[model samples]
Target: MSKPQPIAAANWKCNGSQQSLSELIDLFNSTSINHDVQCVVAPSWYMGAQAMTKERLSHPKFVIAAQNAGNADALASLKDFGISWIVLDHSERRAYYGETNEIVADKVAAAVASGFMVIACIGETLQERSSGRTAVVVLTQITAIAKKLKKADWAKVVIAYEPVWAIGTGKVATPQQAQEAHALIRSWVSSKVGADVAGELRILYGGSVNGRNARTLYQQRDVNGFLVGGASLKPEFVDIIKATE
Candidate 1:
C-alpha cells in the first residue's frame, strides 16, 4: 500500500503579526510540496488573512485554518473568506473555556454543513493517563464526534491527539506511548466508521512536537503528521516539515 501522505500543521494560536507574514512567505518560498506531504497554518483569527491571501493561497500544499471556530455561522463565514479548515476541541479550549464533547460534536456537524474540513482534537490528562483512563477518555471524545459524522464526512475530518498533559508542558509522549495512543484512536475509528474509512483517516500527534523529535514521532505507524505549537514559530519548523519527506 502507498504511504498515507502527511499533513504538517502550524497552530500559531494567538501569536503573529504583520511582521509574521514574512515567516509565511519564507515557508512558502522554502518548501516544495507535492503528494508526499501537505502543510496547514492555523493562525489566530486576525492573522488569517495574512496566511490565506493570493500568493500564499497559490501553493497547492499550503492552506490556512482558523484556530477558533465552533459555530455553523462562523464556519460558513470563514468559508466565504476562502478558509477551508478549522481546528476544534483543543485541550486548552476544553479546560479554560469549558468546551464539552457534546459542543465539539455539534461543531463537527456544523462543519459538514459549512463545507470546511475539521482537525478535531482529543486526548487525556496526565492524571487520567496515570489512572489508566487514557483510552477511555480519548474513546469517549471520539465517540462524541463520531456520532455526529456521516461516513461521507470522515474524509473531511483529521483527528489530532493532543494529550492535555503534554501540550506546552514541555513533556512529550514516547514513541511507544504515541504509537499505542494513535493505534487505539485508529481502532476507535474502525469501530465507529468502519475499516475502509479508518484506513484512510489521518491521526496527528499534537503535543510538544518539535524538530528534534518530529522525525521520531513521524516514524510511528499511526502518527500521520503533526499539529505543532512553539517549535512551529522558529525556522526549525522547516526541519519538521522536512521530516515528512
Candidate 2:
C-alpha cells in the first residue's frame, strides 16, 4: 500500500449547532477540495456521526470526529457509526473543566478499544513553557498516554501539541519554534515507544494556526496536521483543508 497522505481536520468544539451546521456543510460541499488531502471535521458528539452520514455532501474524504467522549463506554454507543476519530483531551478541557491526566487516559484507551482514531492532545502551560520545560512537559503527557495505550494502538492516534499560551493569545509559534516542538515530540515518541509507531504518528501544532501560516507549518518535517481554534469557523477552514493541493 502507498503511504498515508496528509490529513487536515478542523475541530469545531461546541461551536455550531445543526442550524449553523448546515452553513458549515454548505461551505465545504460547495468548495473545491484538493484530491491529495484527507479532510475531516470534529463537530460536537450529537452532530459528529450524524454529520458523517450526510448524503448531500458525499465526500467521505471529509470525515467526522467526536469532539470529546467519556472513557468508559462512550465508544460503545458510537462504534458502529461512521465517525472516524476522537479528540481525547484538549487543553480547554484541562484548564476550564479541570480534566486530569487519569481521566484522559481512560478516554484514550476507550476510543482505541472501540477502533476509533484518537487525536490525543498534549501541551505546556505558559509557566511551564516559559520556565524552559516545554520538552519535559510534552514528553510527560505523551508518556502518560503511552502507559495506558498498547504499542500497536498508535496506528490510529494523532498527537496534537497545542501550547496553552499560544492557543488563543494571538501568540503564534514561529515555523522554527513549531518545528522544534514537533521534532521534540517526535523524539519522545521514538524514544519512549518504538521508531515505527513514531514514524506513523502525526505530531501537530495546534496554537492559533491560520491560512497565512498553514502551508509553512505543514511543511515542517514532523508537523503532520493542525488543530485550529478561532479560524476553524470560517472559509479559512477550507483553506487549511486545501493545503495538500
Candidate 3:
C-alpha cells in the first residue's frame, strides 16, 4: 500500500502554558534524531494567539492551531505574527457547545477567507455509531460543507473523521472499519464534490490513535494520519510520529 505522508494533530484540549507548554515544545522539537511525521500543536484559545506565532514556536517545523473558535467571529489576523493554521468543528465543540453543521461551514469560510489552513472536523456521534450510521453521518457533514464551500476553499481544508464513540474511549475502529469509512468518505468527495478535491484533501483518522496502532492504521489505503487525543499529551506523541518513518 502507498504510504500517505502522515501528520499528528495534537489537540492539547485545555492545557498549560509557559513551563509546561515549553517543555512539550522542547520534547517534540529535539526528541529523536529522525522522525517522518509532521506535528501541529493546538493550544487553548484563552492564551491568545501569541503561543502559535512562527517565532515563539521553538522549532521551525512545529505549527500551531486555535483549540476552538466561535463560528461567527472572524479569526484575529495571524499575518502580523506569521501563524497559519486553525482548527474548526472539533467534536468537543459540537458535544460540549451548540455548534451545528451550518455553524461549522460559516467558521470554515471565515478561516479560509482570512488566510489559514482549516482542519475541518466531522465525526459520527456515539448514538449514530450504535445505529450503524457512521458512514451516513460523515457523508452528510462532508456533503453539506462541500456545497457551501467554493472549490478553491477545499485545498485549505483537512477532514478529520473523529468517531465520537472511539474518542477517549480506548476502543479504536479496527483497520478494516477505518479503511472502509475513509474510502467511503473519499468516494463521497469524488461524487459530491469533485475528483480533484476528493483526491487532494487529507482524511485523518481520529480517536485513540497512538504509536502501537499508528503504523497499522496509517498503512490503510484510505487512512491518512491521526488526530491524537491523550497520547498527544506525552512523549508517545513522538513515538507515534516516529512510526511514520
Candidate 4:
C-alpha cells in the first residue's frame, strides 16, 4: 500500500446520537471522496453498531474503528463482530484508567498478533513537552511496543501523535510543532523497523485537529492523516475529511 493513502479518521469519544450518526453517514454517502484519502469512523458504545454492520454500514469509503481493544475478551468481541480496525492506547485511556505503557504494549502485541489493524496512540504531557522530554516520553512508549511488532504488521499499524496538552483544551500544535513531533516519530520507526517500513508508516496528528487547520497539518511531510476528536461529530469533520483534496 504505497505509504498508506491519507486517512481522515473519527474518534467520537463520548458523543453521538442516531440522528447525528445518520447525518454524518449521509454526508459521507453523498460526499465525493478522493480515493487518496480514506475515511474511518469510531464511536462510543452508543455508536449504534447494530444498524451499521455489514451491508447496513454506511459507505464503502468508510471503515468502522473501535475506540478500544485492550484485552482478550474485547479483542475477541471485535473479531466476532467482524471488525478488525481499532484504536488503542489513546491518551484518555492512559490518563483515566492508569494504563501504563507496558499494558499498552501488551495490548498492541495481542491485537496485531490477532490480525487487527491498530491505531496505536503515543504522546507527551504539557509538563513533559515543556521540560524538553517530549521525545523521551514518546520514544519510550513506542520502543516498548516495537519489539512486539513484526515486519508483517507494518501495514496494519498507524501511529497517532496526540500531544496530551493540546487535546480537548481548545489548543493545537502549530503546523511546525506538529511536524517536528511527527518527523521524530518517523525517524524513531526508521531506526527500529528500518527506513523502508518507516517510510510507509502513516503518522497521524491527533491534537485538536479540526477543519480549521487540517489542511496545514496535511501539508507536513510526516502528517499522513488525522485522529479527530470533537470536530469529528460535526459537519466541520467534512472539511477535515477533504483537507487533502
- Give one digit per residue, the lDDT tens place, for model 2 in 156-203: 788888888888788888888888888887787788788888888877
User: What are the lDDT scores of the predictions, listed in order?
Assistant: 0.80, 0.74, 0.73, 0.80
User: Model 3 — TM-score against the truth?
Assistant: 0.87
Ranking by lDDT: 4, 1, 2, 3
> TM-score per candidate, in order?
0.91, 0.88, 0.87, 0.92
As a whole number from 0 to 100, the lDDT of residue 106 in candidate 3 is 75
Write model 3 residue lDDT over 1-245, tens digit each, in one string: 34445567888766555456656676776765364555788776455433543334666556787755554343664544455787775555676674677778777878777777888878888888789888888777777777677888888888888887888889898888888888888898888778877777778888888889888887788876788878887778877776555
lDDT of 4 by residue, 56-136 (tens): 556777888887776678888888877888888455576666578887777888888888888998888888888999888
Query: Evaluated with TM-score, which candidate comes out highest?
Result: 4
Question: How far off is residue 131 in model 2, in Å?
Answer: 1.6
Question: 8-94, model 1: which lDDT tens digit per residue?
Answer: 888877665656656565766656754577788777656554444434545667778877675567777788778888888556577
* Angstrom error at residue 72, model 3: 7.7
- Candidate 3 residue pairs in backbone clash: none
Model 1 alpha-carbon drift over 4 Å, by segment: 16-18, 33-35, 47-58
State the lDDT at 203 in candidate 2. 76
RMSD per candidate (Å) reads 2.1, 2.8, 2.6, 2.1
The ten-residue window of minimal lDDT in model 3 covers: 47-56
- Cα shift from native, residue 75, model 1 (Å): 1.6
